[PDB]
């Protein structure tokens, strides 16, 4: 199995952007997807229970499309590295990375 992402994305301050990962070349069951930064959870999509949004992001994260997420009302403080962690059976964990830069043109 391989997890692939855009790698680097840029978006304008105040706008919204979709963060997304694609798991391919595996038939493993996706049971949970965690979206996070290094020291901070954004949101989790659990296959059985639905979406959990972290308190720090409640009013600025829209779940989806699909297993991605839309980060809204971007600030320049959102520039940084994001991770998408797929928990799958039987393969285990796949981890994707996205670097986001929020621009002030």
């Amino acid at each position, epitope marked *: 199995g391989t997890i692939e992402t855009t790698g680097n994305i840029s978006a304008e301050k105040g706008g919204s952007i979709i963060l997304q990962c694609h798991l391919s070349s595996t038939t493993a069951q996706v049971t*949970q997807v965690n979206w996070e930064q290094q020291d901070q959870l954004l949101a989790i999509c659990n*296959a*059985d229970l639905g979406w*959990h949004i972290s308190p720090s992001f409640k009013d600025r994260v829209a779940p989806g499309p699909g297993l991605g997420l839309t980060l809204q009302s971007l600030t320049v403080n959102d520039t940084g590295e994001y991770f998408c962690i797929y928990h799958t059976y039987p393969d*285990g*964990t796949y981890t994707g990375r996205i670097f986001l830069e929020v621009l002030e043109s």
Partner: antibody
Amino acid sequence: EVQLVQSGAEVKKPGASVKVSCKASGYTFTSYYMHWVRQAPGQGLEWMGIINPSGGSTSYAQKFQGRVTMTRDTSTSTVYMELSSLRSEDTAVYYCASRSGSGWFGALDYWGQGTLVTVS
Amino acid sequence: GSEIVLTQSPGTLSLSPGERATLSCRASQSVSSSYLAWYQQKPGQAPRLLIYGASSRATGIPDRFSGSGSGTDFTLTISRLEPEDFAVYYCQQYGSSPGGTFGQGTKVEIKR
């Protein structure tokens, strides 16, 4: 203070089913998830699954899918866990656990007293 | 299936009151500190939450219990061991599912 009070010990033959319960008291809000976690002799903790506030949604560990059914009596604040096709590896102390919030994510700060289920 | 495995060391600690107890946990893959918990289980009792988010103390838990670590290696420290701390201590990560996975525990024994 939140209290989780579980049903009493059970002895079951191999191949039988067992149904254990836990009543929650002391919550200052209505909606909370409920988990079950078991502890076989000398081993560590093993999460079994979770049920949502209404009882309409559940999630079980892969090894228990097909063998475990949780239900919830919202009117009595009681959760039930039924485990079928009992085998020796199922002898364990079964714990109900929950947490100090309404969502399903986080460590578990509330625990029942345990229910010993012995198979043979 | 491949699950995240937590390996606690040592299996047993035997220390005297007032000493420092250092408990270690190795994770089979790197895990965010937002997902790490420690529990204390005294004999015949249910687990009791001590630490969550790797380093935050649960309500009512005194500062002598502290958690630290990152990536694949985490620790629970009891700064002054007390006789009532006789218990098995479990590490948990709760990031892979609502309940996650647990280590096998470190038994802490108190001398004399």
